[PDB]
Amino acid sequence: PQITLWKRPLVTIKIGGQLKEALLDTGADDTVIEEMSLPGRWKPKMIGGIGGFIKVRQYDQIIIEIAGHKAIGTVLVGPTPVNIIGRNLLTQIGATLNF
Amino acid sequence: PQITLWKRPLVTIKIGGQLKEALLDTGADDTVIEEMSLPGRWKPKMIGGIGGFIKVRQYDQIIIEIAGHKAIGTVLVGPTPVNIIGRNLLTQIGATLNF
Numbered sequence: 001p002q003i004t005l006w007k008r009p010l011v012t013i014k015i016g017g018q019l020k021e022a023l024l025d026t027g028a029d030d031t032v033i034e035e036m037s038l039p040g041r042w043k044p045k046m047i048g049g050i051g052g053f054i055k056v057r058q059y060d061q062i063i064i065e066i067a068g069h070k071a072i073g074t075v076l077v078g079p080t081p082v083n084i085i086g087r088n089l090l091t092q093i094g095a096t097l098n099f
Numbered sequence: 100p101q102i103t104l105w106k107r108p109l110v111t112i113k114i115g116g117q118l119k120e121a122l123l124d125t126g127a128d129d130t131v132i133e134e135m136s137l138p139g140r141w142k143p144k145m146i147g148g149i150g151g152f153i154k155v156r157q158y159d160q161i162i163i164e165i166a167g168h169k170a171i172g173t174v175l176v177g178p179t180p181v182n183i184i185g186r187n188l189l190t191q192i193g194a195t196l197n198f
């Protein structure tokens with residue numbers, strides 16, 4: 001598919017047995033998901049955005065479907081106002097930026 | 100070009116006649132450049148993301164070249180951690196996401 005950028009590039013994702021909306025974000029190294037009760041072990045992490053750092057929980061080998069494309073990798077869970085799909089997962093679904 | 104996402108999608112920009120490196124960022128509504136001297140009039144604004152808000156200088160109708168492509172639009176200047184080209188200018192250069 002092709003997604004234009006006139007509006008936020010939001011797609012449906014499936015994670016943890018739940019459907020959510022998330023932003024395909026070429027400017028994010030990592031994938032940040034809103035607070036959700038994922039099972040199993042995690043590692044504390046802090047990640048930085050434009051206004052400073054927040055605390056998140058790092059979960060590895062998490063299965064996530066992005067716009068119908070299966071992916072598996074690390075997901076950072078914490079208090080974000082928007083779910084962000086970063087390059088660690090965008091590469092797995094073969095996403096490019098084109099102009 | 101077609102840009103893949105195994106590395107950050109950094110390109111060279113020209114702004115105010117000066118070369119800089121910036122990130123092509125589909126998860127950003129706006130374009131935010133590090134503190135610099137820039138010709139044009141500006142007004143104070145705040146912009147937010149992960150971590151909260153920062154104070155910036157809003158410059159409208161600024162000429163910028165992004166990887167060799169021309170855009171003319173709003174540039175926010177302030178203490179961003181990285182130079183970000185957001186959707187307001189990615190649309191101008193005809194960028195899309197594809198997978």
Ligand SMILES: CC(C)c1nc(CN(C)C(=O)N[C@H](C(=O)N[C@@H](Cc2ccccc2)C[C@H](O)[C@H](Cc2ccccc2)NC(=O)OCc2cncs2)C(C)C)cs1
Nearest residue numbers: 027028029048049050081082126127128129147148149180
């Ligand atoms: C839900 C609602 C609040 C929203 N508002 C928006 C519109 N807004 C404010 C933004 O687009 N704001 C932008 C932004 O930070 N976007 C973000 C998504 C977001 C949006 C709103 C609230 C929280 C996160 C998404 C952006 O790709 C930023 C860009 C960035 C890159 C490196 C360093 C600093 C920043 N990426 C990150 O947040 O993580 C970046 C990581 C840091 N180092 C490597 S990757 C820019 C202005 C920079 C979208 S959703």
Ligand code: NA
Nearest residue numbers: 010011012021
């Ligand atoms: Na959708």
Ligand code: NA
Nearest residue numbers: 029107180181
């Ligand atoms: Na860095």
